[PDB]
Symmetry: C2
Subunit: 121 residues, 2 copies
């Protein structure tokens, strides 16, 4: 959703570990910095379409290693109000331990994240 | 606005806060991941040529906010053996406060970084 959009690889290593497709552009200008408390709503899918979780705010500290790796990397690239879809390889998410019983080991996952707000360190 | 020689904006906000120039291509086949422990050698200079600090190994876990933001951002993109030059905006560095007496308020900093290795974790 929607086809003209191609997953841009945002993994800092550029190993295609995190492909982002902006679903809805933010109309704002502000963006999160490492250390900020961010507020988002999300939904998580297994590649086969199984919805494993959903804030439907969820909040956390950006760039502290507090959330999934794919998350620390993606949210640092969203405008407030932006909705995006990120495709996460196992190692940027749950790895080989998975999350019983909802997420198997070595699961490539897909997240729809909407950035609502953030507040400075 | 940086001249081509200051390097490429690798700041996830694409706001030019972290301009990286690759001075020696890494030969390794692995790159660090968030949470891994990295060992580096660095030297930092204020824009005016002033050397304020130099590790001539420095060690920390990547992506946890244990070092200046520009370092979690830059190092996440390096190969082992790679030597780079980061150019960072106060806000990806020491901001308004600075670090008296050597680093003034709102100082744009330049670092030479060499990644020697990193541990799995």
């Amino acid at each position: 959703a929607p086809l003209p959009m191609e997953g841009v690889d945002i993994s800092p290593k550029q190993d295609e570990g995190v492909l982002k497709v902006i679903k809805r552009e933010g109309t704002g200008t502000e963006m999160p910095m490492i250390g900020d408390r961010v507020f988002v709503h999300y939904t998580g899918w297994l590649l086969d379409g199984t919805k494993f979780d959903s804030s439907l705010k969820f909040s956390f500290d950006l760039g502290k290693g507090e959330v999934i790796k794919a998350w620390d990397i993606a949210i640092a690239t969203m405008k407030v109000g932006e909705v995006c879809h990120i495709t996460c390889k196992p190692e940027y998410a749950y790895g080989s331990a998975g999350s019983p019983p909802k997420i198997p080991p070595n699961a490539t996952l897909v997240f729809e994240v909407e950035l609502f707000e953030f507040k400075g360190e």
